[PDB]
What does this fold into?
Amino acid sequence: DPPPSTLLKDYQNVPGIEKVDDVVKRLLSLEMANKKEMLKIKQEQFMKKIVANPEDTRSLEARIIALSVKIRSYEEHLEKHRKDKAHKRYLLMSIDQRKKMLKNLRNTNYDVFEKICWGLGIEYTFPP
Amino acid sequence: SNEDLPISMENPYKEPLKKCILCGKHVDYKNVQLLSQFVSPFTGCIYGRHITGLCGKKQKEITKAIKRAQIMGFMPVTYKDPAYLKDPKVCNIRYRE
Amino acid sequence: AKHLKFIARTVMVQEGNVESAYRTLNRILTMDGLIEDIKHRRYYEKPCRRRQRESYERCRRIYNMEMARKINFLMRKNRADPWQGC
Amino acid sequence: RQFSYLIENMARDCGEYAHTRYFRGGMLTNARLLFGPTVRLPDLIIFLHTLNNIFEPHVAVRDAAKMNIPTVGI
Amino acid sequence: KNVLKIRRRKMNHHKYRKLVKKT
Amino acid sequence: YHEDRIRAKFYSVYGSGQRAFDLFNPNFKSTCQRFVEKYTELQKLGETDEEKLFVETGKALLAEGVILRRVG
Amino acid sequence: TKFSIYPPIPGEESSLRWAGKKFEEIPIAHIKASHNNTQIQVVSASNEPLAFASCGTEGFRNAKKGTGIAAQTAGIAAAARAKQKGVIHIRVVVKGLGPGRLSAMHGLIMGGLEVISITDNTPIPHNGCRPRKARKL
Amino acid sequence: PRYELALILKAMQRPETAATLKRTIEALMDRGAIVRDLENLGERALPYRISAHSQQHNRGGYFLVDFYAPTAAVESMVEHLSRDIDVIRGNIVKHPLTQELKECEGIVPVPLAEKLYSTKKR
Amino acid sequence: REVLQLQEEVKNFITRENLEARVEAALDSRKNYNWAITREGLVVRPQR
RNA sequence: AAACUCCAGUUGACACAAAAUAGACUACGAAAGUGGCUUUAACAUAUCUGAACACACAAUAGCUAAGACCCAAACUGGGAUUAGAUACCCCACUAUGCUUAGCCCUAAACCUCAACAGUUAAAUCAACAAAACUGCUCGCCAGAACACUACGAGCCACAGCUUAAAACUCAAA
Ligand SMILES: CN[C@@H]1[C@H](O[C@H]2[C@H](O[C@H]3[C@H](O)[C@@H](O)[C@H](NC(=N)N)[C@@H](O)[C@@H]3NC(=N)N)O[C@@H](C)[C@]2(O)C=O)O[C@@H](CO)[C@H](O)[C@H]1O
Ligand code: FES
Ligand SMILES: [K+]
Ligand SMILES: [Mg+2]
Ligand SMILES: [Mg+2]
Ligand SMILES: [Mg+2]
Ligand SMILES: [Mg+2]
Ligand SMILES: [Mg+2]
Ligand SMILES: [Mg+2]
Ligand SMILES: [Mg+2]
Ligand SMILES: [Mg+2]
Ligand SMILES: [Mg+2]
Ligand SMILES: [Mg+2]
Ligand SMILES: [Mg+2]
Ligand SMILES: [Mg+2]
Ligand SMILES: [Mg+2]
Ligand SMILES: [Mg+2]
Ligand SMILES: [Mg+2]
Ligand SMILES: [Mg+2]
It folds into this structure.
């Protein structure tokens, strides 16, 4: 879980933000943002770790990473909201959509399939 | 060929689309003087878009702002504050006659 | 209960003409809808019945507006026949 | 109705016939009874106004096609 | 449309539910 | 037509003037049409911008005595 | 000045006086026009009961109380008990859409009382409690 | 995020009102807030009678506190305003200036619905 | 540009050191968010 | 008529209930469904299709357990009507509707009009309704009734739900 002091994806690139006030760096951090700003950084970390070209986000490899961050988001929402049937369906459908991506990626490029399963910790399983 | 033939062009005589009185303005829940202009002075009921003349997007901003100002301790509910009774009438509704 | 009294739904009497004040007050309550609301709140109107009445009232308006819009559009043609005899 | 007078006069001027009045159903498709067995129908019908007063096609347009009469129309 | 086919099923179900309460 | 853009701007700035149309007269020239003729004639000279061309057309009509009261 | 139909707010100073008394001081006539009865109670500015009358207290029974003549009779009976205590001008606060909603207002005028305002305080909830089920009669 | 604390204080004197605001602004800083401004809307009459802490109030002071704080600080501060005896009513809403207003081009006329019924001679 | 604008504003932000002084200043001034509108779309600021 | 008469009216204090106007809007969501305020989390998928039974949901009613209780209210009791009145009308009150935790798994769950893509030409098209078609796929259906049954299986369901025949019978529906 990226620390709360981590800067936002957008702001970090801007030059001259290294030497500014501590309060201006705290307003641009993850502490004063919502949960969707921390998920944009988690997706950024995986792409550098896994995909050769992070810039391309329309690839199958990128889509798996973008959808796996939502799965963790839903599991954190369902650990506190157990009776939320709406987000329990968005999770189970997302796990089925990722299984279809791992099948198509395992049939085309088995090299990246092993890389993604190792990076994300996905134990691929064949259907019954 | 001929040079008198008409040309493919968008209507130049077209008039600019009409706008509501509150187009381009921010509707805040603290401005009870503006939110009281769209409520009945006797019952406190919110007027519709056939009276106010507002658009769908601004009509729901007044409604959402009135309900929020009412429950926060900024605006009455059963009546219109008498202080804002001598303000410009913008709603199309005549009671007395 | 918690609001100020004698502001809401209050009309002052001019030269002891109570009749005009009561008619004005009743016109304020009918235009706002309070009169009809109080009549439907005496007996509980089930959701399904309340949705059937809103649709009936909305389709009646649509029809009445168009019929009126045509009557005002064709009232110009209610003049005397200019070609009497042909 | 505005041009009913004008058309009737021209028809008289050009030695031809006119009908600017209400078309009684059967003038053409029932002429034998209305006029007689030895009646001669028109060989050419000129429609200066193809619509009636309720903005619908004149009945004679279809009644002239049933009787195989050629029609001219504005 | 009529409900002449629902009235046939209406009594069938009523007679069946009334027989289960008796037995 | 190409002169409809010029007409739309002439009416907006000045609107229909006192002079009334005479549709019966086939060869009737309206005040706006006269403006367009001058405007088109000045385009042949070589001016490539509407704002200057439009402003220059108005002055010519004023020199000829035409009345062009703005909506102002 | 002109004449407005809106009541004079207490705080802001006005010039409208009735027998040397401000609008706030004028007594109030609380009318509860129900469907089967009509109760009338006159009170002062300090909520002090001066007179009470109703169709039942005037000798009406059952379905005669839900008429316009019984409400008018009840107004005369309350406008005759309050006129002995020094009441002339009143503020009418009608509550209910019953038959004796306007007939009681006439009866108060037939007792020597002058109505200066007409207030409606008919209970309207913003959905609260559920009414009884509709009837087939 | 950036919030707005619509605070309605009890009608008191200047020494007591300033002690309450400071006590309230220090509670935000303790929860991780970055207060930005403190606007005063003035003391007026309430629209309706408010009953709080076994007291029926008819007047109050309106103060706005614009600030930045984490999402978890809003729920903890709402429990601090419910225990303060000098705070009639206090609500936290997202600042309206962090919500860009989409540009409007005007009212689009809507043409009557067509082809709703078959063109057959009923 | 946003960072630069924010950097200027943060200076005015209330701090523990200047907390008491700012409170007193707030109690002397008043902010009015009330403004009506006409049928033409013009804002009618209150004369106060 | 019964009922009530610590009853009624004004004022004041006071909710684990329900959410006027806006809404002449037509939005969200897979559907069910959702219309008081605020905040947090948050609304799958860069081809489509794809299940009575897998997986997960599903109005009202209902069961079990513990709380709450303004009002409404099956049952029940009383009053009246009536040839009778186990009903319609009046009164009172309960289960229930609410919360928490489990279950049940149904609907005229019907916009009775499957999902995706596309067209408006030709023979427009039995009728009515919400104009008529094409491609592709899944699901279903073949006289009526017996039958939202019987048996069997499965199910926290034990007067239940799902799935679901035949014989006898008619010449119509
Ligand atoms: C054209 N024939 C019509 C038809 O007649 C039928 C009619 O057939 C009846 C059967 O006998 C009886 O067992 C059968 N009874 C049963 N319990 N199933 C009747 O339902 C049946 N009638 C019918 N389906 N409409 O009675 C028979 C004697 C009949 O005349 C045979 O042809 O049905 C009659 C009406 O029942 C009509 O009056 C006739 O016009
Ligand atoms: S018309 Fe642009 S906001 Fe109402
Ligand atoms: K349906
Ligand atoms: Mg049967
Ligand atoms: Mg509500
Ligand atoms: Mg599918
Ligand atoms: Mg199958
Ligand atoms: Mg099923
Ligand atoms: Mg269910
Ligand atoms: Mg239940
Ligand atoms: Mg009860
Ligand atoms: Mg009985
Ligand atoms: Mg109960
Ligand atoms: Mg439904
Ligand atoms: Mg399908
Ligand atoms: Mg069969
Ligand atoms: Mg069933
Ligand atoms: Mg069965
Ligand atoms: Mg069985």
Remarks:
- The beta strands of chain D are 45-47, 71-73.
- The CA atoms of residues 20 and 41 of chain D lie 17 Å apart.
- Chains D and I do not touch (no CB pair under 8 Å).
- The radius of gyration of chain D is 13 Å.
